[PDB]
Each structure stands twice: as C-alpha cells, then as structure tokens.
Design a protein around this ligand. Structure first.
Ligand code: ATP
Ligand code: ATP
Ligand code: MG
Ligand code: MG
Length: 1355
C-alpha cells in the first residue's frame, strides 16, 4: 500500500497485496461477526419452514460450487506466497457458512435475507475492485477469480427474489429491498391518491402486532413480576417485554450515527478536491452511497422505534382493559373512570413518544463526548472549562425536570378528574338538562380545565427555560473554552476549526430538552400505570363457586365489606338456600340486599366467613345494563340462538308487545346505554338476557320494580314464579313488592345490614315480629351513528380557528421571534463561514449573536407554548359549550366514545402535540426561506432552478397528504369505538363478571384495538415511505451537484453549490415532513370543530320572549295535541293528546310500561321538540319561551336516579345557591337525614362514579331531596317511588303531599296505591289518553284503569 498507484495516479488501481488481503477479509469477516448474532433472530423469531423450491436449491448448489472453486485455489497453491494459502481457505469456509446460512434460513422460514443480500453486495463490490485490477493487469489463478465473480453475481441476483411462503399485510411477504425501502405500501399511496382511503382499503394487522399476541405477553410478565414481589416494578416487565425487539434499533442507531459523522468528512474532502479527476469521481459515488445507506439505516431504526411504541400502546390498552375487568370495587372507586380512560387513551401516547427518544439518551452524549475528543486533539485540555459548563446544565436542568415531573403528575391528575366529570355528564346528560344544570357542570369542568392548563403552562415555562439554557450552552462551551485557553494562541485557522465542531456539538444539546421532557412524561405515565396495575383485584375464590351439596347457596357467618377501610356492610350473614327454592330478599332502603347479591357475585370483599354458591350465576342489576347491540344480541348476550327457547323467553318476559311497537322488532339498535328503551323495557330486556342464559342460580335484583302490576304479574307467573321457566333453578329475588311473598318458598328480611328474620310467608306471619307488623300494615334501524372520517383537505377554517384562538398578538410575536432567531443564526453563520482583530472582536461576535439566538429560541418557546395554552383554553371551551348545547337526541345517536375522544385524546393532541408541531413547522419553513435567500445571493444565476427544486418537493408533499390525512383521520375514527367499549365494559363490570363473559369482552376489546392499529400502522409506514423518497431526492441532488462541481473544477462557487444544495434539500426534506405532520395534527382540531356544525337545542335564554318572574304561579299545563316523535323516521308516541290539567291539580299519568308516560315528561321540558302541537303553561307557549326559562321553573324526579361523582352537597345543588341549613332541611324531608348524618363525612360525602356509592333507593331519595330543594309550582314525579320499600314509599308520598300541596304535580307511577289519592289520572296505553278523569270515576267506568287496579290488588 503506497500512494503512488492507489491515489496519486489517474489509474484507480489497488495494490496486489491489498487486493488479496483486505478486499477478501471484508466480506468473509462480515458474515463471521453477523453469523452468531443472526442465530438470536433466527431462533427467537420462527415462521415454519419453506418448501423445497428451485430457487432455494439453486442458491445452495451455487454455494457448494463457490466453496469448491475457492478451495480449488488452495489446491493449485498446494500444487509460495503466504497469502495464497490463508485467503482461499478463509474464503471457502465463510462460503461454507453462507450456504449453511441459506439452508438454516430455509429451515426457519425467512423469504428475504438482509444479511445474505448485503453480504453478497459487499462481496460483489470487493470482487469488482479486484476484477477491474485483474482486467487492467492483462489464466492460472485469474480464471478462478472470474468464475468466483460470476457465481457471486448470480448468487446476488438470486438473493433478491423472495421465496415461497411457509387482506394480508404486504410486509409479511415483501422482499428485502421492498421492506428496506417501504415499497410494500406504495400501492396504497397511489390508491389513497385517487380516492380517499377507507377502513376497507386498510390491511389487516400483522400477526406479531396483533393484540392477542402482544397483550398476553405483557400480562404474563406482569404476573411473574407480582409473584416475585410476594413492589413490582413496571419498568422491569417493560424491557422484559419490548427490549428483545427494540434492541436492534441500537445497532441501527449506532450505524447511522457513525455514517452521519462520516458523511460530512467526505463532503469536506470533496469540496477541497475542487487531486486527479478520478479522486472526485470516486468522492461523489462514495458520498452518494454513504448517504443512501445512512437514510436506509436511520429509517429502519425509526420504523423499529415506532413499531415498538405501537406495540407498547396495544399492550398497555389491553392490560388496562383486563385489569379493569378484574379490578375490585374499592380500587375501581379509587381509580376513577377518568383515570382508566387517561391510562388507555393518553398514557401510552407518552410511551410512544418515549420510544423515539429512549435511543437518543445514549446517542446524544456519544456525539457530545466525541466532539470533546475531536476538540481535544484539535486544541488541548483547556476544554476542562467547556465540559464543566456543559456538566453544570445537567443538574440545573434536572432540578427543573424534577419540578416539571411534579407538574405533570398534578396535570395528569387534573386531567383524570376532568375526564371523570365529563363521563358523568355523558351518563346523566338527560338529568343534567332536565334540571338545567348544564351551566353549573360546564363551570365545574372549566375550573378543572383552568387548573390543568395553569399547571401545563408552568411546565411549558420550565421546558422553555431548559430549551433556552441548552441552546445557549454550546455558545458558552466555546466562549469559556477559548477564554481559559488564551490564559498556544488562537490562529484564525486553529480557533475556527474548533467553532465548526461547536456548531456540530450544539445538535445533541438542542435535541436534549425534548428527550428530557419525554422521559419525564413517560416516567409519570409509568408511575400512574404501575399504580393502576398494582391495585387490589377482587378474589372470586372467596365465593366457593362449586359446579353442579343440594344447598345451592350457603353462607356461614359472612362479614362482607365493600372496602377494608369502610365498616362491613353485611354483618354476620348466615343462610342456606336449598336447590330450586324461590327466595325473596326483602328489606328497607340501604340494608344490603343488593350488597348481598353482589357478595354472592364475589364483587364484595369478605372479611371472614364461608360462602358457597353452586352452579352458574345469572344476575340482573337493579339498574339494567344494556350495550349498543340490538335486542336480539342483548337477550342472547353471546349465546347460540335457539328459536324455540328465544321465542319462549321473549313471550314469557312480556317483551313481545314492546317488540311489536318497536320499529324493526327485536333487531333494532338499542343505543349506548339502553336509552332507546324505557325503564320497564330495559328491566325486561335485562331479565330476559339473564333468563335466556340457562344458569343454575338466578340472583334477581328488582327486575319488576319498573314495570306495571299486570306486566309484573305476567312475568312473575311466567318466568320467576313456581310455574315459570325458572321453576327448577334456585332464585334469589330481591324485591320490595309484597304481592308475591305468599308464592315465596323462603323470605329473608335484611335489616341494618344483617339477617333479621328468615322463613316463609306463613312462617313469618306467625312469629309476631317486626316483619309481622310490616305485613299487617301492608306498607335495521341503526340508531347509533358511528364516527365518520372527512374526505378531503382539512378546511382552512380549522387553521383559522386555531389561529384566532391563539390571538393576533401572540401569533405575530411568535412569527417575529422565529424570523429573528433564524436571521440571527444566518448572521452568525455568515460571520463565521465566509469571514473565517479576529480574537476578541470576532469569536465574541459568534458568542454574542449566539446568545442573541438563544434568547429568541427562548422567546418563541415561551410564545408558542403560551399560545398553546390559549388555543387549548378556547378549543376546549367551545367544545364544552358545543357538546352541552347539543340536544338529547344527539347524545342518543352519538355513542359515548366520540364525545370522550374529543375530551381525552383530540384535546390532548391540541394541548401539547400541536403547539410543538407548529413550532417545528415554523422553524423548518423559515430555515427553507433562509437557505433560499442564501443560495439566491450567492450565484444568482442558480435562482432559475430554485422554483423547480421546490415544485417537485411540493408535489411529493401533496401526493403524501392526500393519503396521510385520511390515515390519521381513520386512526381517530378507529379509536372512537374503543373508548365506547371501555365505557360499556366499565358500566357493566358486575354483569360481565356474573355471566362469565369476560373472555368474550376481552376479545371484543382486542378486535377494536386491532382495528385502531390497522388504521395507525400504515400511518407510520407512510411517514417512512415518504421520508425515504424525500431524503433520496436530496441525496440525488447532492450527488448530482457533487457531480457537477467535479465536472466543472477548472471551469466557472461550484464547490459551495453542493454544500448549498445538500443543505437546501435537507431543509426541504424537513419542511415537507413537518408540513405533513402539522396537516395530520390539525385533524384533531377538525374533529373538535365537527360538533360546531351539529344541530343543537333551542336557545337557552330568549331575551325578547322572557316570561314573568312568577310565570308558573298557577301551573295550568294545557296540552293541545302535542304529537311527539323522537326522530323523523319513526311513528308518533304522543298521538293527539288533549289534557287540561288545572292549576294545583294532583294529576297522575299512569299506564302500561312503554306507553309514553315519561315521553310526556320529556316533552314538557322541551327535551324532545313537539312534532305537532304545543303546551300553553299559564297562557305562555313553551315552544316560544327560552329553554332555561322553562326548565328552571319546572321540577322533575327522573325515572333513573343518577348521582354525579363528587360531594353529596354538590349533587344536591351544583350551583351552590342554597345554604347548608336549607340543604339539611331538604335532606330531612327526604328521609335521608339519618343516613347522611351517620356518614363520616356528613354532607361532604364523596359519591362514587355515577352514584354507585349509594343504593338506588338512596339515589331516588337524593333526587327527591334535590326536587324539594328546587320546589317550583310544577312538579313531575317520574316513578320516584320505584325502588324504595313500602314504608319509605308512603313516607315519600306523605311529604310530597305535604310540601307539594298547592302546585300542579304530574305523577307517572306503576304503584297505583300512590295515585288513588290523586284528583284525576291520565291513562296511557299506546300514546293515547284512554281514560281521562277522576280515579273514582274511572273505577266506576270499569275500564282499563279498573283492570290495572285489579292487578295492583286495590279492588
Ligand atoms: N330515549 C328514547 N328515545 C327514543 N325512544 C324512546 C326513548 N325512551 C323510550 N323510548 C320509546 O318510546 C316509547 C315510550 O317510552 P316511555 O319511556 O315514554 O314509556 P313509559 O310508558 O313511560 O315507560 P316506563 O313505564 O318504563 O316508564 C317506547 O316505545 C320506548 O321504547
Ligand atoms: N359500591 C358501594 N360502595 C359502598 N357502599 C355502597 C355501595 N353500594 C351501596 N352501598 C351502600 O351499602 C348499603 C346497602 O346498599 P344496597 O344497595 O345493598 O341496599 P338495598 O337495601 O339493597 O337498597 P335498595 O332498597 O335501594 O334496593 C347502603 O348504605 C348503600 O349506600
Ligand atoms: Mg338495592
Ligand atoms: Mg318512564
């Protein structure tokens, strides 16, 4: 090796020894270092074995022949030079390793081999170099090399084709080149360019990325962690679950780092070249191939990080779902629904963000410590000053990082609260609007959001300070280093060969703050998720659930408690129910009857006892849980359809007439929460679902409380009673009605939480006890609309909405600071680059401009972020207004997964992602403008080609967004259902656990997450594909310029026209990518604004048509016809009703279940707009009155008692306009004073999510108490005495008559004994007033009211 023949001569020729040693050691060596490592992948990852094909054999045979040929050389050498022995033998054995490797790759099922192809490419290049040398030299050993080269070339061509396999994702069958360049998606790219992409065009998820192949692994690792603990560290299972695949990104990152620092070296040598021409010709090809390899390796790395992050999100969502399924009630109360929604919606987004920066945590300092080494051999140990200054920032910024962490914690917590509150608003929206409480809860959510945004603003301030100090650190590194060095000297050369590296070193310092912020957010997320996954899970084992002694349900001294901290609810429970025995659990409000049933379901923590429940359990919750599936799928509940039994169950449960009056019968969609159905129909559907599932034990909790006497008797005789379908099954019937007690085989009285009395009706009527006194006293359609993805470019109105929310001043402040920051850098660059009194009057200028840059970097960092606070403060508020203003029909048709999506994930994207992405987009755009100015001032003749360079880039940008947006849109549209499922799963956890349908719901959640990732994975693959092409465009303008600067070296600066072209292509690549990122992120604002155009309710307050202050003073409600139609696709439910309710008239709207009684109440409050007719209350038409002017003047006690999570006093009046003394009085007339007073927290008692902390009787009492609090001249009593005992029932009626004595009251009830005291009643059968007079007159008429009183036992 000497420079005369290798570099100095115009003939590019290697030396003979170099040819025979290094050129042969390179490829053989590559396979030797990779071979061992490759067994790891070949072993850990398997896909079967490929069959015997001609291609595989062709490759194997050529591997055998190639080895022979190489050993044939050793034979001829055996037949002086030392290299003529070792080299042929080494090549033969590495060749024997190559053929063995394709053999084992066949065995392990790999169609395209990256190793073989790259290995053959390197061998080919080495052979090409020797080939050219051997053909320039000119039989004996040359012909062996020609045979070797031809065989190697054919082997390389063969290695490109993909072998046979052992809406599929093309990656599973793509060739090696297709996957290294992400070509397997280009088909969807052009498709997505001709028509908008839909979910149908999207490919099915890869097997490795599928939820049921990812979540289980994480669950198993977590279970192994917990076993070791008996705290379990979530981080341990994380890398024990995601490192085996992620660690290859370390190799890709290292290779990319090495080659990205090697590239500029080649650039500098090339621009120094403009040294025989060949030198530059080689220089440009080497630079081109190194750049292309850099892009490919960096981009496969990015893909690995993104796929690992997506798998992390899938695993986190699945684990959260499973834990929520197995969670206990105490932990479920502790970890609110908002917290679970945050964990599964944006907590894994933090991990996804981390996945891109967890590889930079070691790369940044690697480049840093190298630059110090480059600077060292450049200058000397004076850098001790520089390293110290850089080190000083680490703790200083870490201190702030710690502070930021706290903020994030608080922030995350505030977020949970907000989401939890929103969930309550979604669940009790009908009650919220009926009570005119939309404004109060809007203000509550606004206060929570303001607190969360203040915390986020402080966190953004600290992040801006950290970014500022990190950006000013390198300027200090230099300033301090030169400062100590002067006290050799700083020759313009030595001094400035150090400044260039300082700029190179400032890259990691600029990227660090992002890494720190992502790590802090991911650490907070890990903490929240580890705390959740470590929550106590209820033990089913506690209830010996023996399969089918004959004592179906036996209990021995059970002390069940809802939580360990709280006192036990069940005190010494002990009873034994024989098989097939009808059991009624009677009692007053809040005595643990539903607690007893949930204790038999293992939903209650057992302090001590022995409970054995034998046989399958079928449970019906007092509040019926209904999913979005139709009635047939609700009754089936994932069961095989048997028409003979399904029809019998439907007919027996008195559900047939309701199906007759339903539009599509039993196939019509039923709504997210059963809001389509009535209370009685909901209860009947839940009971029929339990009955159809043939179980051995049926725990019925008030299944006939919301149905009339006739339908209740029909159901009991045909389903529950001794002559019903359930006659052979043990049945625990928790009921308050005592009409069916004589039929009961065993009656258990639950008083104070314990078994006060046990026996039959005839046994308890002779004991002469408390229950004896109680008995003596006798007192398809497709309703839901799924999320829709917009088809087209996002409207510029969305960008305007995000800009006008930020504000004019903040927007220009930010644009001006961006422009100033990038101008300052360009001045600093021009002051150093071209202009390279120097000491003190030039290096200082570099520091001065540099500091002037950092402050501006700080400036917009504090200007965009606060803008992100402003817009998120507006975008949410309008949304919070827009959602509430929407009518009840909107919440009916829109599932509670779109509304949660806007408030959880799209809002999060608006909060944090969009401001940062806007910041980076503005930075890239101004960088491109600055580069355009730079290359315009220098060589203005080149300005002709500047627009074309941009034009082509523009086209690529367009060609990409037309697909990319849709993918993002589809991702959001594919994410809305998942939330819904969680909500549904969170609403009916007890039902799912009791029916043992946990596995089916787990599979449904896996399917929904699989759809979401089917939408999301093509998005990241699209980013990679676009990026490869964009960077390749640059590398093919760098090489092309590098070519045109070496073709014009002695002709009319060319060398700076490459280093200009490359920088302009880079800036352009970043610009096209960041514009695509901003365009995709604006989809979040476009989904938030989607609800703005949604039709909403009538104006809340009509100023002109305001009623008098004392408007309902008479309360003379007068319907004219008031036809009611929920949607303009169904039949009327209030066809031509004419009532003339007088002032202060006790009127009772009684009728059969599902007749339209509560539709009257919904129409009185204008909740559902009238189809034909009007209501003139006190000579004032409500159609004309303002919405609040109507709803604030009329009280209602809703059928479904919903208590929003929070303080009990907050539930009684969220407006907080009643004094605590008055609220105490209102609780006293509700017969709840004792219960609230024995509570440890008194009125500040925290109600659970949806009020589950209280019994439904106590929730009805709370509704009555808040009705007493309002107490206007119109009271609507929508079945208030529906799930309360007879003693409480009469107490409620007594106080109602007492307090509501001079106000018009419209009472809908199935208990006719509460309506006989009413002056007149309204009888409803099919939305028609059949009988309209006094109850005595109707009884004389012997009509339908008489019959209803007959089934009620009142005659
Ligand atoms: N939110 C709703 N949207 C559309 N239709 C509904 C809704 N709620 C009930 N319906 C339907 O309207 C009809 C009357 O319902 P409504 O609840 O007014 O009857 P009801 O006799 O008062 O019932 P219940 O006895 O259970 O209180 C039924 O066909 C019912 O399924
Ligand atoms: N999830 C819960 N956590 C804690 N306490 C609860 C919970 N659910 C109910 N309770 C309380 O436990 C007691 C008994 O509740 P339970 O619903 O079993 O009573 P009940 O007599 O069956 O009610 P109802 O008369 O309304 O049918 C009440 O004080 C109630 O507020
Ligand atoms: Mg109950
Ligand atoms: Mg009703």
């Amino acid at each position: 090796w000497e420079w005369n023949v290798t570099w100095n001569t115009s003939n590019p020729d290697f030396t003979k020894c170099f040819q025979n040693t290094v050129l042969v050691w390179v490829p053989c060596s590559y396979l030797w270092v990779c071979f061992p490592f490759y067994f790891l992948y070949l072993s850990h990852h398997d896909r079967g074995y490929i069959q015997m094909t001609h291609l595989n054999k062709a490759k194997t045979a050529l591997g055998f022949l190639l080895w022979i040929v190489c050993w044939a050389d050793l034979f001829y050498s055996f037949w002086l030079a030392p290299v003529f022995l070792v080299s042929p033998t080494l090549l033969g054995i590495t060749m024997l390793l190559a053929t063995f490797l394709i053999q084992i790759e066949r065995r392990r099922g790999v169609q395209s081999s990256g190793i073989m192809l790259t290995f053959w490419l390197i061998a080919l290049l080495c052979a090409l170099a020797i080939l050219r040398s051997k053909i320039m030299t000119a039989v004996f050993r040359d012909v062996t090399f020609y045979i070797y080269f031809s065989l190697v070339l054919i082997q390389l061509v063969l290695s490109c084709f993909s072998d046979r396999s052992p809406n599929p994702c093309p990656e599973s069958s793509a060739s090696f080149l297709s996957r290294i360049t992400f070509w397997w998606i280009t088909g969807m790219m052009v498709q997505g360019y001709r028509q908008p992409l839909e979910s149908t065009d999207l490919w099915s998820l890869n097997k490795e990325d599928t939820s049921e192949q990812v979540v289980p692994v994480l669950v198993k690792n977590w279970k192994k962690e917990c076993a070791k603990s008996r705290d379990p560290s979530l981080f341990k299972v994380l890398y024990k679950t995601f490192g085996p695949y992620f660690l290859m990104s370390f190799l890709f990152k290292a290779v990319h780092d090495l080659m990205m620092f090697a590239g500029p070296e080649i650039l500098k040598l090339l621009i120094n070249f403009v040294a025989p021409e060949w030198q530059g010709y080689f220089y440009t090809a080497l630079l081109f191939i190194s750049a292309c390899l850099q892009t490919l390796v960096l981009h496969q790395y990015f893909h690995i990080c993104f796929v690992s992050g997506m798998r992390i999100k899938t695993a986190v969502i699945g684990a959260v779902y499973r834990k929520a399924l197995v969670i206990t009630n105490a932990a479920r109360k502790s970890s609110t629904v908002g917290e679970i929604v945050n964990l599964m919606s944006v907590d894994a987004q933090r991990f996804m963000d981390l996945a891109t920066y967890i590889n930079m945590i070691w790369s940044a300092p690697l480049q840093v410590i190298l630059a110090l080494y480059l600077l060292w051999l450049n200058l000397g140990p004076s850098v001790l000053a520089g390293v110290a200054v850089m080190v000083l920032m680490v703790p200083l910024n870490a201190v702030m990082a710690m502070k930021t962490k706290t903020y994030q914690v608080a922030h995350m917590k505030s977020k949970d609260n907000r989401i939890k509150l929103m969930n309550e608003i979604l669940n009790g929206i009908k009650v919220l609007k009926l009570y005119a409480w939309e404004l109060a809860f809007k203000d509550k959510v606004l206060a929570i959001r303001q607190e969360e945004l203040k915390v986020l603003k402080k966190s953004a301030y600290l992040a801006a300070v950290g970014t500022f100090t990190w950006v000013c650190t390198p300027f200090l590194v230099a300033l301090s280093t030169f400062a100590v060095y002067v006290t050799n000297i700083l020759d313009a050369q030595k001094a400035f060969v150090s400044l260039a590296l300082f700029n190179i070193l400032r890259f990691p310092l600029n990227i660090l703050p992002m890494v720190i912020s992502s790590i802090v957010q991911a650490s907070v997320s890990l903490k929240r998720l580890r705390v959740f996954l470590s929550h106590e899970d209820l033990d089913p084992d506690s209830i010996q659930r023996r399969p089918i002694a004959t004592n179906s349900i036996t209990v021995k001294n059970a002390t069940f408690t809802w939580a360990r901290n709280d006192p036990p609810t069940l005190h010494g429970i002990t009873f034994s129910v024989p098989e097939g025995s009808l059991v009624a659990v009677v009692g007053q409000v809040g005595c643990g009857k539903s607690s007893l049933l949930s204790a038999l379901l293992a939903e209650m923590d057992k302090v001590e006892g022995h409970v054995t429940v034998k046989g399958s359990v079928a449970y019906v919750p007092q509040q019926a849980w209904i999913q979005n599936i139709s009635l047939r799928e609700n009754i089936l509940f994932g069961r095989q359809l048997q028409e003979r039994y399904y029809k019998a169950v439907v007919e027996a449960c008195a559900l047939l007439p309701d199906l007759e009056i339903l539009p599509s019968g039993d196939r019509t969609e039923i709504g997210e929460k059963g809001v389509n159905l009535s209370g009685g129909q909901k209860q009947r559907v839940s009971l029929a679902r339990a009955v159809y599932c043939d179980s051995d034990v049926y725990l019925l909790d008030d299944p006939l409380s919301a149905v009339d006497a006739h339908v209740g008797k029909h159901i009991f005789e045909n389903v529950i009673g001794p002559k019903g379908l359930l006659k052979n099954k043990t049945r625990l019937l928790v009921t308050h009605a005592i009409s069916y007690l004589p039929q009961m085989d065993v009656i258990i009285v639950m008083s104070g939480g314990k078994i006060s009395e046990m026996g039959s009706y005839q046994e308890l009527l002779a004991r002469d006890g408390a229950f004896a006194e109680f008995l003596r006293t006798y007192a398809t359609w497709k309703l839901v609309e799924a999320d829709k993805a917009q088809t087209g470019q996002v409207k510029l109105s969305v960008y305007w909405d995000y800009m006008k929310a930020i504000g004019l001043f903040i927007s220009f402040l930010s644009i001006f600071l961006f422009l100033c920051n990038h101008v300052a850098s360009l001045v600093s660059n021009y002051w150093l680059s071209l202009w390279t009194e120097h000491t003190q009057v030039r290096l200082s200028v570099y520091g001065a401009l540099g500091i002037s840059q950092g402050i501006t970097v700080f400036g917009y960092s504090m200007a965009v972020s606060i803008g992100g606070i402003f817009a998120s403060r507006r975008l949410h508020l309008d949304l919070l207004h827009n959602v509430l203003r929407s009518p009840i029909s909107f919440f009916e048709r829109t599932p509670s997964g779109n509304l949660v999506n806007r408030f959880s994930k799209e809002l999060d994207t608006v909060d944090s992602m969009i401001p940062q992405v806007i910041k980076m987009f503005m930075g890239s755009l101004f960088n491109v403008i600055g580069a355009c100015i730079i290359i315009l001032l220098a060589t203005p003749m080149a300005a002709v080609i500047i627009p074309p360079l941009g034009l082509i880039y523009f086209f690529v940008q367009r060609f990409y967004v037309a697909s990319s947006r849709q993918l993002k849109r589809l991702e959001s549209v594919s994410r809305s259902p998942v939330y819904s499922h969680f909500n549904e799963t969170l609403l009916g956890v007890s039902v799912i656990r009791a029916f043992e349908e946990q596995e089916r719901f787990i599979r449904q959640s896996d399917l929904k997450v699989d759809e979401n990732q089917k939408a999301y994975y093509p998005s990241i693959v699209a980013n990679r594909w676009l990026a490869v092409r964009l960077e390749c465009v640059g590398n093919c303008i760098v090489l092309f310029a590098s070519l045109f600067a070496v073709i014009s070296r002695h002709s009319l600066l060319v060398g700076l026209s490459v280093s200009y072209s490359l920088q302009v292509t880079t800036y352009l690549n970043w610009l096209v990518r960041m514009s695509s990122e901003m365009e995709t992120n604006i989809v979040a604002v476009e989904r938030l604004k989607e609800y703005s155009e949604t039709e909403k309710e009538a104006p809340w307050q009509i100023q002109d048509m305001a009623p008098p202050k004392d408007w309902p003073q008479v309360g003379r409600v007068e319907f004219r016809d008031y036809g009611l139609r929920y949607r303009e696709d169904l039949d009327l439910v209030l066809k031509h009703i004419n009532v003339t309710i007088d002032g202060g008239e006790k009127v009772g709207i009684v009728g059969r279940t599902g007749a339209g009684k509560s539709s009257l109440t919904l129409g009185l409050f204008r909740i559902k707009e009238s189809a034909e007719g009007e209501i003139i209350i006190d000579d004032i038409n409500i159609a004309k009155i303002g919405l609040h002017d109507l709803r604030f003047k009329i009280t209602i006690i809703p059928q479904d008692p919903v208590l929003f999570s929070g303080s009990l006093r907050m539930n009684l009046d969220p407006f907080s306009q009643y004094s605590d003394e008055e609220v105490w009085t209102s609780l006293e007339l509700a017969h709840l004073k004792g219960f609230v007073s024995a509570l440890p927290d008194k009125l500040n008692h925290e109600c659970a999510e949806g009020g589950e902390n209280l019994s439904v009787g106590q929730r009805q009492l709370v509704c009555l108490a808040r009705a007493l609090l309002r107490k206007t001249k119109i009271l609507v009593l929508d079945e208030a005495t529906a799930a309360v005992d007879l003693e409480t029932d009469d107490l409620i009626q007594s106080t109602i008559r007492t307090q509501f004595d001079d106000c018009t009251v419209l009472t809908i009830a199935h208990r006719l004994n509460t309506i006989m005291d009413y002056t007149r009643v309204i009888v409803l059968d099919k939305g028609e007033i059949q009988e309209w007079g006094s109850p005595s007159d109707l009884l004389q008429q012997r009509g339908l009211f008489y019959s209803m009183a007959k089934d009620s036992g009142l005659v």
